[PDB]
Amino acid sequence: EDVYQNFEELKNNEDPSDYGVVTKETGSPVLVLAIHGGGIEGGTSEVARELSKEYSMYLFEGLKSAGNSVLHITSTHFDEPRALKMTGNHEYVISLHGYAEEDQQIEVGGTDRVRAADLVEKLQHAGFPAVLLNMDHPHAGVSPNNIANKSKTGLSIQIEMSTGFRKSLFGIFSLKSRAVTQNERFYEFTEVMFRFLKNSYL
Considering beta carbons, is residue 3 or 22 the nearer one to ligand OCc1ccccc1?
22
Residue nearer to ligand OCc1ccccc1 on the CB measure, 173 or 194: 194
Cβ closest to ligand OCc1ccccc1, residue 194 vs residue 201: 194
133 versus 192: smaller Cβ distance to ligand OCc1ccccc1: 192
Helix axes 184-200, 113-125, angle to 10 degrees: 140
- Say whether residue 194 binds ligand OCc1ccccc1 (CB under 6 A): yes
Query: Taking CB under 6 A as the rule, does residue 8 contact ligand OCc1ccccc1?
Result: no
In the complex, minimum distance from the CB of residue 53 to ligand OCc1ccccc1, in angstroms, rounded to a whole number: 4
Q: Which of residues 56-85 bind ligand OCc1ccccc1 (CB under 6 A)?
A: none
DSSP per-residue letters across 41-90: STTHHHHHHHHTTTSEEEEEEE--SS-GGGG---TTT---HHHHHHHHT-
C-alpha 107, offset from chain centre: 12
Could you tell me which residues come within 8 angstroms of residue 4 by beta carbon, excluding any fewer than 6 positions away? 10, 13, 70, 71, 73
Smallest Cα–Cα separation from 17: which of 33, 48, 38?
A: 38
Q: Least distance (Å) from ligand OCc1ccccc1 to the CB of residue 194?
A: 4
What is the binding site for ligand OCc1ccccc1 (CB under 6 A)?
A: 53-54, 191, 194
